[PDB]
Ligand binder design. Structure first.
Ligand SMILES: *[C@@H]1O[C@H](CO)[C@@H](O[C@@H]2O[C@H](CO)[C@@H](O)[C@H](O)[C@H]2NC(C)=O)[C@H](O)[C@H]1NC(C)=O
Ligand SMILES: *[C@@H]1O[C@H](CO)[C@@H](O)[C@H](O)[C@H]1NC(C)=O
Lengths: 49, 42
């Protein structure tokens, strides 16, 4: 009926606590917002199911 | 020998009635035991 609701912090995963990595990651645009939007969409749907 | 653990972190969800109803909000620190949110007393 459902599966585990994963949420990922895309910045903690890629750059974990490094701010000079995080400034480089901002240069890639919306990709972390897309990845978190997609996983939040799946996570809400596990309750709907 | 010391163990190293990354110090507490997690998702923050903000819970609101609509803006047309109120500006008051509640906040959920997801998977955080809030002995640690007072230890963080932006
Ligand atoms: C949040 O963390 C505290 C510890 O800082 C937990 O308190 C312990 O709970 C267990 C189970 O009741 C007791 O055996 C310990 O003696 C408690 N320690 C202290 C210092 O009180 C608390 O239970 C945690 N909250 C949750 C929901 O697990
Ligand atoms: C806010 O809700 C009321 C009904 O409770 C409605 O009349 C009003 O039009 C709403 N505000 C806006 C900006 O539409």
């Amino acid at each position: 009926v459902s599966m585990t609701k994963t949420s990922v912090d895309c910045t903690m995963y890629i750059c974990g606590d490094s701010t000079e990595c995080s400034n480089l990651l901002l240069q890639y645009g919306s990709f972390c917002t897309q990845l978190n939007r997609a996983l939040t969409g799946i996570a809400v749907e596990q309750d709907k199911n | 020998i010391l163990d190293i653990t990354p110090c507490s972190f997690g998702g923050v969800s903000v819970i609101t009635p609509g803006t047309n109803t109120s500006n008051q909000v509640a906040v959920l620190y997801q998977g955080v035991n809030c002995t640690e949110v007072p230890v963080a007393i932006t």
